[PDB]
């Protein structure tokens, strides 16, 4: 996260962190959607141009964390993975269309004040919250000096035409973009290590937080005038449900 502020304790209790087992390194963000299921970006697990193709046993997740470096006794939980499911139509060669993966925990995580699931959006929530100018929230431990505690930014969704002209890549309806214009109304942004993490929005109608997007590809905290892209969670909701029901 670049140009964020310090998150508060328990502000983002669905925040999950993806680690490489060996050597230990933070790979990505992720989110908790039930006691056993973790949503993340496919490019966090499978990216062949960088020789990245993790199995379950290469990875672990840590949940309920706040401080990047301090061990949080009786607060934070660690979990191993039973199974990884990457969207079969994930397009890593071109545009990272369908950049989505699910991870099943070996064992259920107990919810607490620090660990709690975010909602998947329903149609009505997608239809009314996903509008150009409406703001969402990204949280993470991406490099921008590196965060001591979890960082938060809030970013406006960008108009599709402005997204399209911002990049040479062929964008799709399965993704949306967010960020402040090269003008200025702030200059916050998700970064490389925030990838996989949730883009959440709070519903005024019912007071619940919904995960509307998954932070997609970033390199550094520099997008060179561009906007970050987000996998459109509601459009991929049937797929998420299909994986969960069968497995």
């Amino acid at each position: 996260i670049v140009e964020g502020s310090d998150a508060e304790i328990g502000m983002s209790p669905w925040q999950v962190m993806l680690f490489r087992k060996s050597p230990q390194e933070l790979l990505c963000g992720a989110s908790l959607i039930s006691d056993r299921w973790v949503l993340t970006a496919a490019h966090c697990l499978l990216y062949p141009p960088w020789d990245k193709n993790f199995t379950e046993n290469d990875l672990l997740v840590r949940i309920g964390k706040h401080s990047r470096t301090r061990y949080e006794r009786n607060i934070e939980k660690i979990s191993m993975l039973e199974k990884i499911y990457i969207h079969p139509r994930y397009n890593w060669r071109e545009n990272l269309d369908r950049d989505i993966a699910l991870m099943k925990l070996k064992k259920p995580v107990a919810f607490s004040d620090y660990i709690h699931p975010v909602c998947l959006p329903d149609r009505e929530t997608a239809a009314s919250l996903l509008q150009a100018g409406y703001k969402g929230r990204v949280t993470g431990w991406g490099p921008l000096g590196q965060p001591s505690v979890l960082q938060v930014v809030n970013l406006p969704i960008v108009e599709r035409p402005v997204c399209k002209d911002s990049t040479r890549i062929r964008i799709t309806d399965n993704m949306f973009c967010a960020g402040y214009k090269p003008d200025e109304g702030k200059r916050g942004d998700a970064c490389e290590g925030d990838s996989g993490g949730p883009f959440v929005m709070k519903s005024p109608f019912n007071n619940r937080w919904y995960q509307m997007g998954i932070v997609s590809w970033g390199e550094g905290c520099d997008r060179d005038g561009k906007y970050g892209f987000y996998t459109h969670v509601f459009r991929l909701k049937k797929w998420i449900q299909k994986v969960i029901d069968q497995f």
Binding site: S5, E8, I9, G10, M11, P13, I33, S34, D35, W37, S112, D113, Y114, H116, P117, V118, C119, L120, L129, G133, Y134, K135, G136, R137, V152, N154, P156, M201, K202, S203, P204, N207, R208, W209, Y210
Partner: peptide, 29 residues
């Protein structure tokens, strides 16, 4: 995972507001 989803034990469950959530709700024009 869906009954209590999206309601934070330290925020909504306590009638507590975080520091920047107003910025999001104010944005919904």
């Amino acid at each position: 995972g869906e009954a209590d989803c999206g309601l934070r034990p330290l925020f909504e469950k306590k009638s507590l507001e975080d520091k920047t959530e107003r910025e999001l709700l104010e944005s919904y024009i």
